[PDB]
Design a protein around this motif. Sequence first.
Motif, PDB file in Angstrom:
ATOM      1  N   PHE A 950       0.868  -1.165   0.000  1.00 29.59           N
ATOM      2  CA  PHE A 950       0.000   0.000   0.000  1.00 29.59           C
ATOM      3  C   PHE A 950       0.909   1.220   0.000  1.00 29.59           C
ATOM      4  O   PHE A 950       0.938   1.997   0.955  1.00 29.59           O
ATOM      5  CB  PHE A 950      -0.909  -0.014   1.228  1.00 29.59           C
ATOM      6  N   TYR A 951       1.657   1.366  -1.089  1.00 27.70           N
ATOM      7  CA  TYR A 951       2.746   2.333  -1.181  1.00 27.70           C
ATOM      8  C   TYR A 951       2.321   3.790  -1.031  1.00 27.70           C
ATOM      9  O   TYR A 951       1.178   4.154  -1.307  1.00 27.70           O
ATOM     10  CB  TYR A 951       3.515   2.132  -2.487  1.00 27.70           C
ATOM     11  N   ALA A1034      -8.752  -6.140   0.361  1.00 22.95           N
ATOM     12  CA  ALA A1034      -9.486  -5.578  -0.767  1.00 22.95           C
ATOM     13  C   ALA A1034     -10.209  -4.303  -0.349  1.00 22.95           C
ATOM     14  O   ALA A1034     -10.220  -3.319  -1.090  1.00 22.95           O
ATOM     15  CB  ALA A1034     -10.469  -6.595  -1.326  1.00 22.95           C
ATOM     16  N   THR A1035     -10.808  -4.323   0.839  1.00 21.89           N
ATOM     17  CA  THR A1035     -11.465  -3.127   1.362  1.00 21.89           C
ATOM     18  C   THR A1035     -10.462  -1.986   1.535  1.00 21.89           C
ATOM     19  O   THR A1035     -10.744  -0.847   1.156  1.00 21.89           O
ATOM     20  CB  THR A1035     -12.189  -3.385   2.699  1.00 21.89           C
ATOM     21  N   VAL A1036      -9.298  -2.299   2.101  1.00 21.88           N
ATOM     22  CA  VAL A1036      -8.237  -1.307   2.274  1.00 21.88           C
ATOM     23  C   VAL A1036      -7.858  -0.682   0.937  1.00 21.88           C
ATOM     24  O   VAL A1036      -7.731   0.540   0.818  1.00 21.88           O
ATOM     25  CB  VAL A1036      -6.981  -1.927   2.918  1.00 21.88           C
ATOM     26  N   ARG A1037      -7.697  -1.532  -0.070  1.00 24.76           N
ATOM     27  CA  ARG A1037      -7.361  -1.081  -1.413  1.00 24.76           C
ATOM     28  C   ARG A1037      -8.457  -0.189  -1.987  1.00 24.76           C
ATOM     29  O   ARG A1037      -8.169   0.780  -2.686  1.00 24.76           O
ATOM     30  CB  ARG A1037      -7.111  -2.282  -2.326  1.00 24.76           C
ATOM     31  N   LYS A1038      -9.711  -0.510  -1.682  1.00 19.79           N
ATOM     32  CA  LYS A1038     -10.825   0.327  -2.118  1.00 19.79           C
ATOM     33  C   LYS A1038     -10.785   1.698  -1.451  1.00 19.79           C
ATOM     34  O   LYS A1038     -11.073   2.714  -2.084  1.00 19.79           O
ATOM     35  CB  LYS A1038     -12.166  -0.355  -1.849  1.00 19.79           C
ATOM     36  N   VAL A1039     -10.421   1.721  -0.173  1.00 17.55           N
ATOM     37  CA  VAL A1039     -10.349   2.970   0.578  1.00 17.55           C
ATOM     38  C   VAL A1039      -9.223   3.865   0.068  1.00 17.55           C
ATOM     39  O   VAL A1039      -9.417   5.062  -0.144  1.00 17.55           O
ATOM     40  CB  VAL A1039     -10.157   2.711   2.081  1.00 17.55           C
ATOM     41  N   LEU A1040      -8.049   3.274  -0.134  1.00 13.35           N
ATOM     42  CA  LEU A1040      -6.890   4.020  -0.616  1.00 13.35           C
ATOM     43  C   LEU A1040      -7.099   4.544  -2.038  1.00 13.35           C
ATOM     44  O   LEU A1040      -6.551   5.581  -2.411  1.00 13.35           O
ATOM     45  CB  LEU A1040      -5.627   3.155  -0.549  1.00 13.35           C
TER      46      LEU A1040
END
Length: 1306
Positions: A950-951, A1034-1040
């Motif tokens: 999550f760079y 996946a949720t984290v990626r959606k948020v970012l």
Amino acid sequence: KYSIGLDIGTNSVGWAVITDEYKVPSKKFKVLGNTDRHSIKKNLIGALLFDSGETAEATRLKRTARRRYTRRKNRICYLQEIFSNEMAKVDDSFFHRLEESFLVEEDKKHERHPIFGNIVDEVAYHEKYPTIYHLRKKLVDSTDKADLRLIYLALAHMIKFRGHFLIEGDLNPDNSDVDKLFIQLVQTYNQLFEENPINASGVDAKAILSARLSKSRRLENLIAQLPGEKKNGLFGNLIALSLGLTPNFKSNFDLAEDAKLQLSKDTYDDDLDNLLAQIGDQYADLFLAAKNLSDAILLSDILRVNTEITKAPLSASMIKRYDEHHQDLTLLKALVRQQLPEKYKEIFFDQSKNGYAGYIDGGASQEEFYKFIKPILEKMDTEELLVKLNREDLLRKQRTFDNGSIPHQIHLGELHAILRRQEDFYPFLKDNREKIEKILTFRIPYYVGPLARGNSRFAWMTRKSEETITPWNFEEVVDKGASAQSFIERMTNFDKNLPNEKVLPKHSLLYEYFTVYNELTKVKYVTEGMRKPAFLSGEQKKAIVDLLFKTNRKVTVKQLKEDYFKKIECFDSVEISGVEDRFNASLGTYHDLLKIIKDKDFLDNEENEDILEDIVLTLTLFEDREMIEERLKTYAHLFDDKVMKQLKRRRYTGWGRLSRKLINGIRDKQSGKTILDFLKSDGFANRNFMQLIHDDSLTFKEDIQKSLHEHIANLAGSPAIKKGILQTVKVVDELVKVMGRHKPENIVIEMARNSRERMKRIEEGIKELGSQILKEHPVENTQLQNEKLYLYYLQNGRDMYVDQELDINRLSDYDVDAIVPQSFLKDDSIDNKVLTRSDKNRGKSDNVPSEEVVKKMKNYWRQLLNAKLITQRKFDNLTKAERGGLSELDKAGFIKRQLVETRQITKHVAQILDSRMNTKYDENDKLIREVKVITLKSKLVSDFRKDFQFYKVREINNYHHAHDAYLNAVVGTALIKKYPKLESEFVYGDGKATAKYFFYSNIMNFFKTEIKRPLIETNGETGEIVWDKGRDFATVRKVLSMPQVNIVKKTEVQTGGFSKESILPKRNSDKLIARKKDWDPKKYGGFDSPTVAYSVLVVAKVEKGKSKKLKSVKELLGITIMERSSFEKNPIDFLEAKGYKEVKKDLIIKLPKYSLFELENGRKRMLASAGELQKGNELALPSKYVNFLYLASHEQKQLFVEQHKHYLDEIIEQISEFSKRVILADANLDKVLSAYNKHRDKPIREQAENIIHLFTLTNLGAPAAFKYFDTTIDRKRYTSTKEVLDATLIHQSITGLYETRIDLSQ
RNA sequence: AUAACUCAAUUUGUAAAAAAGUUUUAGAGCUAGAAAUAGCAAGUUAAAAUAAGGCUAGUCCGUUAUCAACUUGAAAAAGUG
DNA sequence: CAATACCATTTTTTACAAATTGAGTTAT
DNA sequence: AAATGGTATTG
Ligand SMILES: [Mg+2]
Ligand SMILES: [Mg+2]
Ligand SMILES: [Mg+2]
Ligand SMILES: [Mg+2]
Ligand SMILES: [Mg+2]
Ligand SMILES: [Mg+2]
Ligand SMILES: [Mg+2]
Ligand SMILES: [Mg+2]
């Protein structure tokens, strides 16, 4: 339902709201205003941005400077009031002409020549006295009656620039007897060393010692005239002492202890006393001679003239400067005529070149001018002019930067001389001589402060009487004593245990008895016979104190054993348990006094306790010796006059932690014993002060038990971080309001972590070290900014681990090693860094430098410590291997400290939040912690980003501020969910080592599937799900990846200085601001570039043309900081004075800096000023491009880079869409495109880094320059605000969740 | 986590002082020649302001902190989606 | 108009109190 | 210590 994530920074507060499954809610918020939208959907993530909070420093400097100016003015006014009547007879309008001297002739009431009133007399004056110092010297030496105006001019010149007050007492220059004095020093020395005498040798001591070189150089030359005599030797050291230097005498006298003497230092008599006690008082006359020589030579740098000729050696030295300047100017002109007449015009006419013309008439400095003519001088045939140049004595003016050396005593000397001279002719000068002298002399004591009368927030002084205060009635009107007392007491701590009681002086005898006993009480001992270690008893303690503590300054463990345990208890060997090496506490004041009063029995007497405590109190509270004496006057009968004289000088600073009543005032009801009594004797249990204070059986404890903004401002720390603290609290409040006034389940908070000082450090450390490395390798302040060079000089050009020299041309080959390895301690400072040619020579990688390195390098480190080139911390870390180095427990500690927050300020934040969120108590009267405040270190989220890709790239936009808060919330909640036992470490409120190490080192593994771990992570005791690898990521990626994020720049009214401080020449421009009411800048010049406090929307009408038609206008007017108050008092009148008419008052909108406006295609602008805008948009770059950029700028990821090179073109495409829609800087964009086109051939890494460079074109806020590769792109600024006047104003909440939008169509 | 002590490094806050710098004016420039324009002569010093200024009138105060919009308040801050 | 290059008061001394960090001794 | 808003000058 929800938790809050917070990231607290100096310029930013990131915030996020998450649900049970780490999702950030999206809510529909109402939009207010006259616009189309009635609502907008917003994600609950964002970040507040704000300009830095500033220290009160610059304000303090400005204020104090102001006070200085007004007081100087008052000095002059006093002088003039003294001279007034007698001046009125000589010249009716003299003082008037003086005060209107700034005015142009057209504006003057009287004639233009100030001194005499006509051309002939004025020209005559300047012909006779080219400088003021000519007049000074003539007025000092002559006997003729002088014109009263000239007398005033001299006196006023000395009073207006009186010189410093760093030397106490008076000086009376006597350069006359330097030869005889030097010969006398040599004489007494030769007496004391009959075996080997120094030859006077016809050494011109006068010339060498009073020469315009530095003290050290003069010393070197002096001993160069002496055969077989070294500068480090005794006589050399003595010469150094006489020169005003600080030499050390220990190597000469075989002393283990340092013996450094400085005649200027107030401790000289005592230091010399100790030295003489050590070496014998037959050396006293030697130092007397050194002092006698020192007095005649003290001011040689300033005086430069034999004191025989004149009673004004300063003014005479200035006249010297003038004459030498003159002669050498004639000479230089002649030379340039002869040898380089082509360059004559540039040197003596052009103001812009740094020549002599640029020197005198232009803004060129003595340094710049010298540097300019150095080559001109040396290239010509002039040999002496260069000598003068190196001496910094070529073409000197009289008013220079280096005149700060001048003490007020010399200006006083000349003043007094002039006064004595002319009091014979003017009676009023005789009657007022003392007053006038006191004008120059008087100085408000720092411990008195501003001479206020109830209207100064800063003042504390108290009035002995109700007069207006003058320098002459100061002592009688001002209560100096109570004022000094207030000066210290307004800042000093009260005892916390007894809040109404003042804290004792740190060097109080009682306080030190308390400390020594508090330490002794917990000392245990064992011998061969006894079966357990035993406490000291009362008797034994009094024994140790009376025998060791009252006889030895410091008491070592060895001294305890041998001098007490062996001698009094006949123990050949014993074990001590409570003390290390030596007792930390000591009765220093007892011995100080003992040296002064000479009466041990006086000190030991209990009846003298109050008196002694009062004496030490007086010594601490005051430092003005004249007041200290007055304070001690009561006790003058107790000891001899010499003893009192010595007692005056003894001075202490600092205050303890506890009060006299706590230590020896309160008595336990049962015992009738004070705390100190229990420290002296408590029988079997030798109880601590801590124990005493908390013992339910004793009565001490019970006897003791008797605004957000202010609270935040009262915390200790940078004001910048405090700004962030207030902001984050407000953010939290608004977030709670957003969430229907339901409190969060958790609040996770994170908090973020020259040259001159360096040059000073090195200079001092080296001078002390006695190293030539500065002379061999000259440095400049800005060079030390380089870490390796700075280190290199801090280590005296030596290897820190290997005892070998380093090379200043080979630093690139050398290594910067962390003393305690970076894996344990994240320390980037100099305290943990070292320069060695190779880090392998440190020894092992997993530890403190090895025992070999310690053994071999220790003494060198000692030298570096003593020269202050390394601190104590650094030293103790360097030497730890001789204490077994780092223990495994220390390793574990470092690891848990890497993720567990110990910083006090963040604990304060957590406490503020916790106290605001949890306000209820249970049936047991204990706090109900509904909300858990969690504090995380940055490493958790940083590592989390690196591990799971999550760079983060800061330069792309300001979204990372919010993202960090989100990840904080997620990781925190997950951490406490998984390990609820870890609540003690991360949550606010009330063999094994290796295990702790591994544990904290592997704490974050539950997030991973393989390091093997299950897909679903749950907590054993409850079974509740903490993490799901299959969907939560996946949720984290959606948020970012969420495009819209509430980034809000705090709109702020500009405060501070009115404008640039520079005073510009006269110019025809409406920009020029008058420096005074009547001073038209077209005639006088003045200020420029004012700061806009805030803009204001005006809709009104203005006159146009010769016939004054009323045209209609809507425009932005910048209200300057200076104009502000006037504008607030009555805005209509202000606007009418500006030329506006029929101003529609109700349409007036206050527009502070950073005001947000939306326009055509989502394009936004922020208000930079009344005439300039900043970029108001955030480029939401897709996460694929961010991650790709991260990986490309810095193996499977490498192949990922090579596979996805088309991403570069896609990213630049994104940037281009963005710029064309929003930035509107076509030229710059074309230069970007071009520059990228040329560099497609270049390596992908480089191209990526430079693409990272490309983002400042698109960044929020003020436009800035950037380089793509070798191509520099100047910023495209937005120099007009017209479009904003028809745009939509967006009023934003602190979170930016609530908006009121105003369509500025009116 | 807390408390006293020791050693040290740092940070914040306050007061009293110094030396420059700058800006106008005063240091009679000169011969030529209508005129710019030349040639030379010169230069180092001083006065005064140094946040505009304010009332509380003191040898005091004037650059920190704090600030969305609407409604309410003096003000903090409150009340509004 | 708006594109563009230049600019921005500096430096020094003395006295003082409070936190905080972080290596140690003793304790709640 | 920048950096970024004021200013004159040019284009
Ligand atoms: Mg952060
Ligand atoms: Mg003033
Ligand atoms: Mg000057
Ligand atoms: Mg010890
Ligand atoms: Mg004192
Ligand atoms: Mg402000
Ligand atoms: Mg000056
Ligand atoms: Mg706002």
